[PDB]
Amino acid sequence: YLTHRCLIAPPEMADDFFANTVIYLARHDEEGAQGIIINRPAGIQIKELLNDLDIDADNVNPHEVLQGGPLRPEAGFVLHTGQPTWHSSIAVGENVCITTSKDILDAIAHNEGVGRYQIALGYASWGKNQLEDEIARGDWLICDADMDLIFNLPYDDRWDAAYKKIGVDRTWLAS
Numbered sequence: 001y002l003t004h005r006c007l008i009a010p011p012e013m014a015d016d017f018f019a020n021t022v023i024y025l026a027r028h029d030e031e032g033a034q035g036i037i038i039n040r041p042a043g044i045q046i047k048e049l050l051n052d053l054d055i056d057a058d059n060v061n062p063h064e065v066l067q068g069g070p071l072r073p074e075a076g077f078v079l080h081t082g083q084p085t086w087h088s089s090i091a092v093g094e095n096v097c098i099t100t101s102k103d104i105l106d107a108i109a110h111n112e113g114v115g116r117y118q119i120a121l122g123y124a125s126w127g128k129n130q131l132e133d134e135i136a137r138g139d140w141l142i143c144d145a146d147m148d149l150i151f152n153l154p155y156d157d158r159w160d161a162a163y164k165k166i167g168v169d170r171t172w173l174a175s
Contacts, residue, residue, distance in 0.1 A: 001029060001033075002033065002131070003025055003026070003027060003093060004024075004092050004094065005142055006022055006023060006149060007021075007142060008142065008143060008159065008162045008163060009140070009141075010139070010141050013139070017070055020039075021037045021039060021040060022037070022038055022039045022159055023035040024036050024037075024079065024145055024149075024150060026092050027092075028131065030128065031128055032126045032128050032131070033125070034123055035069065036066075036077055036118075037066065037068050037069055038079070038118060038149065038150055038158065039158035040066060040067045040155070041064040041066055041155055042064075042066055042121060044121075045063070048065075050109050055105055055106065057110075059110070060111060061111050063108075064155065065120070066119065066120040066155075067120065067122055068124070069120075069122045069124035071122055071123055075100075076100065076119060076120070076121055077100060077119070077123065078098065078099045078100070078118070078119045078120075079096065079097070079098055079119075079150060079151075080097055080116065081115050084099070086099045088101035093145065117151075118150065118151065141162075141163070143165045144165075149162055149165075
């Protein structure tokens with residue numbers, strides 16, 4: 001399936017919500033697919049989010065909180081590296097995990113044991129065969145995920161980078 005891959009909104013996509021997005025696919029099986037947009041900050045600082053979740057974080061390092069999708073804006077997801085060592089954690093792909101337990105939030109609050117990360121509120125979901133049908137009719141572009149797209153690159157440069165990455169192993173004129 002397409003787990004660990006990134007969906008890229010084509011430049012011509014008219015969808016008001018998904019236009020200009022890069023979506024990391026966390027899960028994709030026979031029942032559907034679920035993803036997290038990785039290039040759209042919500043305009044919320046990590047300290048604000050932690051405090052709202054009743055977690056002290058007076059010394060937490062500044063970090064953006066992402067809008068992961070249009071569904072369940074209450075649900076938080078932390079993307080990070082290493083093994084799924086936390087209480088509720090799953091390995092998605094090459095050294096990348098998604099954790100929904102609160103233990104990792106305490107780690108983030110104290111600036112330790114987390115490393116590079118993204119925390120997103122909300123997610124994107126597709127029903128059975130839905131994503132496959134959309135891809136079939138050319139609704140999405142696709143590229144492999146990597147550390148730059150998920151963690152290193154500035155959020156506002158991720159769509160361009162993903163769009164360009166398509167051309168690393170195939171003839172692709174990004175223009």
